[PDB]
Write a protein that binds this ligand. Structure first.
Ligand SMILES: Nc1ncnc2c1ncn2[C@@H]1O[C@H](COP(=O)(O)OP(=O)(O)O)[C@@H](O)[C@H]1O
Ligand SMILES: Nc1ncnc2c1ncn2[C@@H]1O[C@H](COP(=O)(O)OP(=O)(O)O)[C@@H](O)[C@H]1O
Lengths: 285, 640, 295, 77
C-alpha cells in the first residue's frame, strides 16, 4: 500500500511531465515543454536534466508539490525511475540526475531545522574551501572468490558495506567482500563548505558554516569566495566527534527477545550532524 | 491515594489540587506584596491563550506560594520538576477541553484540544549560583543569570527511529521513548523467520532539535575565592536559537548529571559524572535593565513569529502608556530625566545629559542598500581624577542591556574580536565572539582609554567609521557587524590637566582620533566654595539611612518608569529633521569651521536624539540650539 | 556524624579501672582506619530512634526515597512471613527464615548520613596516651599506607566539587526489581541484560537502564597540598600531595590556605608509562576525614 | 633605605588570613590576572588567578612597588 501510494505518486508525476507543462499560446515557446528538454539533452547526450519547480507547484494545486517537497527523500527513487520510464518510452550507460530550481522561498542557514530534514529546501550562502573531485561507488560489483564475483548491486545509502544477499555460494553467508575496482559505476564528487552570508548574521552570534556535498554534473559549478543559491536534497551525515556534548544520547542496543538462549550485545551509538547536499547550484547574487 | 514510587506525588488529587487553584486565584500575591486587577488572572490569560493558540502557558511559580491549597504543590514542583510538569500539562489540557464544552462550538472545532499544551514554570526560588549546588540536588528547578559566550549549531536528536528490511522489504519503525533504540532482530515481511539483516535508514526517521548554549554565569553574591565558572545548557525544541550570544538572561531549568565515555571506543563510562542545566524557561527581557532595539532584532521578530514562541520584546500595559504620554507633556522633562539617571552622582548635569542622549542616540538609515549610519553616538570624557567618571561607566553598564565593560591594558586587538579557540569539550576549533562583537547594540564602556597599547586603538578606527569590523585572519574571512556606542574614560597627563597649555595637546591621543569622537567632555573643578560644602552635604549623607533610602530626596525622580519610557521612545519613534533645521544646522558647522566635518555628522545625529525624546517625529528648528550647546558646553570648559 | 578519638580515650580510661579490660580501639583505629568506617557504620545503623518523626513534604528529597525504601523493606518481610506462617508446620525461627530468603535494600545503600573521624592531639597525648603528628609531605614515607594521618601544608588548586557515583541503580522494568552495582576507581562499565533473580534462568532476560535519582552519589572534590616551605630541607624543593574529599567536608578547603588535614591514607592503582612500571606500585593519595585550618 | 618598612608587611600578611605577600619582578602581570588552563580530572579550562584574586576579602601586600613597570600598575590602578 505504501508501495502502492508511493507508486501512485510516481504515476502522478510522470503524468505531470508528460502532460502539458506549458500554457503559453500563439508566439512561443508553444507547449510542451519538458519533452523539448529531454530532446535538447538528447542532442549532446550528457544525461542530466533541469526542470522548474514553479510549474509543478501550480499544476496540481500543489498536493503533488507538497507531496514532493515534504517526503522528497522518500520520493527520489520513484521520480528518477519514472524519468527512466519516459526515456525508455520515447528515447533509445544509464545515469540520471534530476534537479529542480526556482523555489518560491529562501531559508537562511541559521533558520535550518530538523523538521525540514530529508526534504528539499533552499539555502544561499558564501562558498568556502572547495575540494578536489573524487569518485564514489553507489553501484559496485563485489563478491568473494567463492564461488563467483561480478555480482553488481546495492551499497545505495552511505555505508559503504556490503553485498546484501545470495552469498557466497556455495559457502552461503554472511562472509564479506571482495571488491573489484575493475567493475563498478562511479560519479563525481567534490565537497564544498558553505558559510553564512556576511551581511545577514545576528549579533553577535558570528557566522557558522555548514557543509554541502556536490554530486552530479552540478560538480565544479560552485566557486570559492562567492554567493550562491542551492536547492535542497538535504539529508544527514553521522559524527563520531560529539561526546561530552552532553547527552542524553540515543543508542542502537538490539532487541534479542526473539530466538532463544542456549553476537553479544552489539551496541552502536547513533549521533548525526546535519549537512546540506546539493542537486542544483547557481551563482545568482 | 495511589502514589508514584519515589515522588510522594499522588497521581491526580494533585490535579484537583491544581485545578481549584487554576480556576480560582485572583491575587493573593499582593498579600505578600503587602498591597498598600480585581478578577482572577488565569482564566482570562488562558482565554487569550486559547484564541491566540500560542500554547506555552508559562505559569509563574510563585503564584502558588502563597495560596491555599497548593501550598504543597509548590514544594512538589521545586523538588520533582519533570513528573509534576507532566501532570500539570495534562491538567491544563483537560481544563482546556472542559472550558470549551461550556461554550459549545469552539474554534472549529475539536482539533485544538488535542494539540499539546505545556508549562514553562519560571521565577522559581532564589538560588545561589551553580557552583554552590550540592549533589543532593540533581534534579530540581534552578535559576541562573549571566551573559552567553557562544552557541553551537543545531544538533539533531532522534524521536522516532526508522527501519527497512533486506526482505521483503517492509518499512516499519520503532519509536525511541526511553533513551535507547532497540531494533527487532527479525523480521517483518517475510516473517517467516528469517534472520535477514534489518537495515536502519537514517534519512527517514524523525528528529527534534537539541542546541547547546554555553553560559558564563553571574550569581553575584560571590563567596569568593571563586572565579567565574562556565556552564553548558542544552535547551530543546522551540527554545532553540531563541537566545543570541551576549544577552543577559534569567534562565531557569532542571539541574542534570550525565557520564561521558572516556575511551570513545570501549563501552566504558568515566564515572565522576559531568553536570549541566536543562533550561525549561528563559527570562530574556528584564524590568530593571533597558530594552533591546528593534532594528537589531529584525529577523528574530520576522522569525519566531512563524513557529511562534514566547517573551522577547518587553510588553507594556495601556494605562502606564497613558502615563508616559502624560509625562512627555511636562516641560522640565529634558532636565528631569537628566537628574534621574545618576541619583548618587551630583551636579555635572550635562554629562548625565549627553549620556541621556547616548541612550536615545540617532536614527537608523538603510537607503536603498548600504547606508547604515545607525544611531551610534560616541563619547569620551576626561578630567581631574575622583570626578565620578568611572561611576557613570558602572551605571550605564548596569542599564544598557548588551554592553560590555573593558579596562585599559587588560585589552588586545585579538581580545576585542575573533579568538578562534579550541573548544576542549569536543576537542575542536570553535569561533568565539570578541568583546566588541558582543557589545554590538547598546553600549561598550571603556576604562583608561588613553592608556591603550598602540596596536589597540587601531581596532577603533575601523569601528567608529565603518560601524563594522573586517576580519580576514586565520580560519574564516568575513566582515562582521558590530554596531555599538562607546563611552571612554580618559585621564589627562597632569593628572590635573591644568590651566593653559594646548588642551588639544593635553588630552594626549592622536588628534585625528580625538576629533572623531561625537561629544568630548572635559570636566574641571573651579574650586567653588560654595560647592564642596554642598557636595559634602550630598555624599556625607548615608550616614542615614544605613539601609539606603531617599538618595537625592527631596527630588522628583522616576525609577523603573524611565526605562520603559526610554525603551518606548526608542522603538516607537523615528525622528526626521525635515526642512527647518538645515539653515541653522549648517551655519553652526560653519561657525565652528571659522574642527572637521565629523562635528556636523555629530550634531545631526546627537540632535535627532533630543527630538527622538519628547516624542516628536519631526525636529523643531528649536532643540538644535542646545544640541549645539552641548558641543559648546565643553568649550565653555575649554576657556581656562 | 563526627566521631572523635578523644572521647574514646576517655571511654577506655573508664573501662580500664573499673574493668573489665577492654581491647584497645584507638591503636587499632589509626593502624587500619579504613575498615572501621564501614564497620563503625553498621554498628550505628542498628540502634537509632526508630520513627522518629513525620517526613512532611519538604523536609527534603532523598529523604523520602530513603523513607520509602525502608518502608518497602519492612513490608516485604511482613508479607513473606505472613505467607509462610499460613502453611505451617520457637517463633524466632520463622523470622530467621523470612530474613534469609528475601532480598532487601542493603543497609549501606540506605543510610542518609556520613561518618568522619577526628584524630587526637593534644592534651590527651600527654595524658599520657600519635594519630596526630602533623607531618610534612617529605615526612611521609610510603610505609604509612592505610594509617590515619595528620599533615600540615598549603592547599593549592582544589578543583570544583562534582557528583561522583558510589552505587548505580538500574530498573529492569520487566522483572521489576532494581540492580545496584557498586562502582570503584576512575571508570566502570555499565551492565546490561539483567541480573534479576526473576530474570535469571528465564528464556528471555529483560533489559535495564539507569535512573540517576535512585543511585547513591557523593560530593567529590580533590585538592593538592604542598610542603609548608619552612619544613623543606635546606636543598631540594617543596613536594606535592593529592587529597580526596567526599560527603560533607566538601567546599571546606580553598587555595592559599595553611592547614592541618586529618585523614585515613589510602592507595589507588596507577603507574607512569606502561613500560615504566616494575609493578605493581600504588601511586597513592590522601583521604580527608577532618579539616583544621590555621589562621 | 632602612626603617624596616617591609617587615610590617610580612607582619600583616602573617597576621591577616587571606593575606598574600608579593613583589614586582616578582609577581608577573600574569601573576595577578587569571590564566585559562585546562583542569585535570574535572573539566575544563578553569580560570586560575593569583595575587589579587588569590587574596581577596583580605589584605594584599606589595614590595618594590616602583619596579613593577607598567602593565601591573594599570591593574592596581
Ligand atoms: N559629583 C559627584 N557626585 C557623587 N559622587 C561623586 C561626585 N564626584 C565624585 N564622587 C565620588 O568620588 C568617586 C569618584 O571616583 P572616580 O571619579 O571613579 O575616580 P577617577 O576620576 O580617577 O576615575 C566616586 O566614588 C564618586 O561616588
Ligand atoms: N624600629 C626598628 N625595630 C626593629 N628593627 C628595625 C627597626 N628599624 C629598622 N630595623 C631593621 O631594618 C631592617 C630593614 O629591613 P626591610 O624592611 O626588609 O628593608 P627596608 O629597610 O627597605 O624596609 C629590618 O631587618 C629590621 O630588622
Amino acid at each position: 500500500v505504501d508501495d502502492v501510494t508511493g507508486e501512485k505518486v510516481r504515476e502522478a508525476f510522470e503524468q505531470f511531465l508528460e502532460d502539458f507543462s506549458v500554457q503559453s499560446t500563439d508566439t512561443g515557446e508553444v507547449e510542451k515543454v519538458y519533452r523539448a528538454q529531454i530532446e535538447f539533452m538528447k542532442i549532446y547526450d550528457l544525461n542530466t536534466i533541469y526542470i522548474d519547480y514553479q510549474h509543478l507547484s501550480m499544476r496540481e494545486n500543489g498536493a503533488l508539490a507538497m507531496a514532493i517537497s515534504e517526503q522528497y527523500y522518500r520520493f527520489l527513487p520513484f521520480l528518477q525511475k519514472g524519468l527512466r520510464r519516459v526515456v525508455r518510452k520515447y528515447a533509445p550507460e544509464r545515469v540520471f540526475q534530476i534537479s529542480f530550481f526556482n523555489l518560491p522561498t529562501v531559508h537562511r542557514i541559521r533558520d535550518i531545522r530538523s523538521e525540514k530534514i530529508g526534504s528539499l529546501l533552499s539555502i544561499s550562502g558564501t562558498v568556502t574551501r572547495t575540494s578536489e573531485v573524487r569518485p564514489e561507488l553507489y553501484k559496485a560489483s563485489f563478491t568473494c572468490d567463492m564461488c563467483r564475483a561480478i555480482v553488481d548491486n546495492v551499497e545505495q545509502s552511505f555505508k559503504y558495506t556490503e553485498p546484501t544477499f545470495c552469498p557466497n555460494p556455495s559457502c552461503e553467508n554472511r562472509a564479506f567482500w571482495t571488491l573489484n575496482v575493475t567493475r563498478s559505476r562511479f560519479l563525481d564528487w567534490q565537497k564544498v563548505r558553505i558559510q553564512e552570508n556576511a551581511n545577514e548574521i545576528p549579533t553577535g552570534s558570528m557566522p557558522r558554516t555548514l557543509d554541502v556535498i556536490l554530486r552530479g554534473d552540478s560538480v565544479e559549478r560552485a566557486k570559492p569566495g562567492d554567493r550562491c543559491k542551492f536547492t535542497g536534497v538535504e539529508i544527514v551525515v553521522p559524527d563520531v566527534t560529539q561526546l561530552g556534548l552532553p547527552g542524553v544520547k540515543p543508542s542502537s542496543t538490539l532487541d534479542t527477545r526473539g530466538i532463544s538462549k542456549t553476537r553479544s550485545l552489539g551496541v552502536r551509538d547513533l549521533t548525526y550532524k546535519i549537512s546540506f547536499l546539493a542537486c542544483h547550484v547557481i551563482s545568482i547574487g | 491515594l495511589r502514589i508514584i514510587w519515589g515522588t510522594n506525588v499522588s497521581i491526580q488529587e494533585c490535579t484537583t489540587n491544581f485545578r481549584n487553584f487554576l480556576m480560582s486565584f485572583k491575587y493573593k500575591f499582593r498579600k505578600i506584596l503587602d498591597e498598600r486587577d480585581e478578577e482572577l488572572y488565569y482564566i482570562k490569560q488562558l482565554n487569550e491563550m486559547r484564541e491566540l493558540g500560542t500554547s506555552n502557558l508559562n505559569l509563574d511559580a510563585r503564584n502558588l506560594l502563597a495560596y491555599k491549597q497548593t501550598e504543597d504543590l509548590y514544594h512538589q514542583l521545586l523538588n520533582y520538576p519533570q513528573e509534576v510538569i507532566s501532570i500539570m500539562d495534562q491538567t491544563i489540557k483537560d481544563c482546556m477541553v472542559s472550558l470549551i464544552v461550556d461554550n459549545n462550538l469552539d474554534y472549529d472545532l475539536d482539533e485544538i484540544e488535542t494539540k499539546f499544551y505545556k508549562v514553562r514554570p519560571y521565577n522559581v526560588g532564589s538560588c545561589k549560583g551553580m557552583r554552590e549546588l550540592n549533589p543532593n540536588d540533581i534534579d530540581k528547578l534552578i535559576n541562573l543569570k549571566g551573559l552567553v559566550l557562544r552557541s553551537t549549531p543545531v544538533i539533531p536528536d532522534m524521536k522516532v527511529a526508522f527501519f527497512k528490511c533486506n526482505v521483503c522489504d517492509h518499512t516499519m519503525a520503532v519509536e525511541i521513548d526511553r533513551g535507547v533504540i532497540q531494533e527487532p532482530a527479525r523480521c517483518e515481511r517475510i516473517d517467516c523467520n528469517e534472520p535477514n539483516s534489518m537495515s536502519l535508514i537514517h534519512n527517514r526517521c524523525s528528529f527534534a532539535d537539541k542546541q547547546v548554549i554555553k553560559l558564563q554565569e553571574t550569581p553575584d553574591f560571590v563567596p569568593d575565592g571563586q572565579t567565574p565558572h562556565s556552564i553548558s545548557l542544552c535547551v530543546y525544541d522551540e527554545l532553540v536559537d531563541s537566545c543570541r550570544a551576549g544577552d543577559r538572561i534569567e534562565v531557569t531549568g532542571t539541574f542534570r548529571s550525565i557520564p561521558i565515555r572516556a575511551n570513545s571506543r570501549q563501552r566504558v563510562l568515566k564515572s565522576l559524572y559531568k553536570t549541566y542545566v536543562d533550561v525549561v524557561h528563559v527570562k530574556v527581557s528584564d524590568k530593571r535593565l533597558d530594552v533591546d532595539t528593534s532594528t537589531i532584532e529584525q529577523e528574530l521578530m520576522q522569525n519566531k513569529v512563524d513557529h511562534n514562541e514566547v517573551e522577547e520584546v518587553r510588553q507594556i500595559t495601556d494605562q502606564d502608556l497613558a502615563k508616559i504620554r502624560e509625562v512627555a507633556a511636562r516641560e522640565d522633562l529634558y532636565s528631569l530625566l537628566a537628574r534621574s539617571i545618576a541619583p548618587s552622582i551630583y551636579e555635572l548635569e550635562d554629562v548625565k545629559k549627553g549620556i541621556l542622549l547616548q541612550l536615545f542616540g540617532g536614527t537608523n538609515k538603510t537607503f536603498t542598500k548600504g547606508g547604515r549610519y545607525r544611531g551610534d553616538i560616541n563619547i569620551l570624557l576626561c578630567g581631574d581624577p575622583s570626578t565620578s567618571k568611572s561611576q557613570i561607566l558602572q551605571y550605564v553598564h548596569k542599564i544598557t542591556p548588551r554592553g560590555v565593560y573593558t579596562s585599559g591594558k587588560g585589552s588586545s586587538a585579538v581580545g576585542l574580536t575573533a579568538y578562534i579557540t579550541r573548544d576542549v569539550d569536543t576537542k575542536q576549533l570553535v569561533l568565539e565572539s570578541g568583546a566588541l562583537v558582543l557589545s554590538d547594540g547598546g553600549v561598550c564602556c571603556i576604562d583608561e582609554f588613553d592608556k591603550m597599547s598602540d596596536s589597540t586603538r587601531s581596532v577603533l578606527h575601523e569601528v567608529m567609521e565603518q560601524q563594522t569590523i573586517s576580519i580576514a585572519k586565520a580560519g574564516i574571512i568575513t566582515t562582521l557587524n558590530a554596531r555599538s556606542s562607546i563611552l571612554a574614560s580618559a585621564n589627562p597627563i597632569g593628572s590635573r590637566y591644568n590651566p593653559n597649555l594646548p588642551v588639544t595637546e593635553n588630552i594626549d591621543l592622536p588628534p585625528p582620533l580625538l576629533s572623531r569622537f561625537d561629544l568630548v567632555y572635559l570636566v574641571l573643578d573651579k574650586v567653588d566654595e560654595k560647592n564642596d560644602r554642598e557636595l559634602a552635604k550630598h555624599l556625607t549623607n548615608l550616614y542615614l539611612e544605613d539601609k539606603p533610602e531617599h538618595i537625592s530626596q527631596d527630588d522628583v525622580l522616576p525609577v523603573e518608569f524611565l526605562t520603559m519610557y526610554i525603551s518606548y521612545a526608542k522603538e516607537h519613534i523615528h525622528p526626521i529633521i525635515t526642512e527647518a533645521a538645515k539653515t541653522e544646522l549648517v551655519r553652526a558647522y560653519v561657525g565652528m569651521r571659522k574642527a572637521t566635518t565629523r562635528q556636523l555628522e555629530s550634531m545631526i545625529r546627537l540632535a535627532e536624539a533630543h527630538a527622538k525624546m519628547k516624542l516628536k517625529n519631526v525636529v523643531e528648528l528649536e532643540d538644535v540650539q542646545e544640541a549645539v550647546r552641548l558641543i559648546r558646553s565643553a568649550i565653555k570648559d575649554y576657556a581656562t | 556524624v563526627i566521631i572523635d578519638l578523644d572521647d574514646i580515650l576517655q571511654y577506655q580510661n573508664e573501662k580500664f579501672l573499673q574493668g573489665t579490660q577492654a581491647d584497645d580501639l584507638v591503636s587499632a583505629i589509626q593502624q587500619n582506619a579504613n575498615h572501621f568506617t564501614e564497620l563503625f557504620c553498621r554498628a550505628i545503623d542498628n540502634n537509632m530512634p526508630l520513627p522518629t518523626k513525620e517526613i512532611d513534604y519538604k523536609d527534603d528529597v532523598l529523604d523520602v526515597i530513603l523513607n520509602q525504601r525502608r518502608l518497602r523493606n519492612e513490608r516485604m518481610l511482613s508479607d513473606r512471613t505472613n505467607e509462610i506462617r499460613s502453611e505451617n508446620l520457637m517463633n524466632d525461627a520463622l523470622r530467621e527464615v523470612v530474613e534469609d530468603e528475601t532480598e532487601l535494600f542493603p543497609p549501606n545503600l540506605t543510610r542518609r548520613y556520613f561518618l568522619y573521624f577526628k584524630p587526637l592531639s593534644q592534651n590527651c597525648a600527654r595524658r599520657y596516651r600519635i594519630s596526630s603528628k602533623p607531618l610534612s609531605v617529605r615526612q611521609i614515607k610510603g610505609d604509612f599506607l592505610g594509617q590515619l594521618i595528620t599533615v600540615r601544608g598549603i592547599i593549592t588548586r582544589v578543583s570544583d566539587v562534582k557528583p561522583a557515583v558510589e552505587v548505580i541503580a538500574y530498573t529492569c522494568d520487566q522483572c521489576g526489581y532494581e540492580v545496584f552495582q557498586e562502582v570503584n576507581s576512575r571508570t566502570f562499565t555499565p551492565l546490561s541484560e539483567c541480573t534479576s533473580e526473576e530474570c535469571s534462568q528465564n528464556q528471555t532476560k529483560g533489559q535495564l537502564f539507569m535512573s540517576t535519582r535512585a543511585s547513591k552519589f557523593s560530593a567529590f572534590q580533590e585538592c593538592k597540598i604542598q610542603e609548608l616551605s619552612q619544613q623543606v630541607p635546606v636543598g631540594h624543593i617543596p613536594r606535592s600531595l593529592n587529597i580526596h574529599v567526599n560527603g560533607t567536608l566538601v567546599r571546606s578547603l580553598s587555595p592559599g590556605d595553611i592547614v592541618d588535614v586529618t585523614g585515613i591514607f589510602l592507595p589507588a592503582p596507577y603507574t607512569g608509562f606502561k613500560a615504566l612500571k616494575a609493578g605493581l606500585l600504588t601511586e597513592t593519595y590522601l583521604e580527608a576525614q577532618f579539616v583544621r585550618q590555621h589562621k | 633605605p632602612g626603617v624596616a618598612k617591609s617587615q610590617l608587611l610580612k607582619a600583616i600578611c602573617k597576621i591577616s588570613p587571606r593575606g598574600v605577600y608579593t613583589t614586582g619582578k616578582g609577581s608577573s602581570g600574569v601573576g595577578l590576572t587569571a590564566a585559562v588552563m585546562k583542569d585535570p580530572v574535572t573539566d575544563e579550562m578553569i580560570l586560575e588567578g593569583g595575587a589579587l584574586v588569590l587574596a581577596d576579602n583580605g589584605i594584599c601586600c606589595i614590595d618594590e612597588f616602583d619596579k613593577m613597570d607598567e602593565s601591573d600598575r594599570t591593574a592596581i590602578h
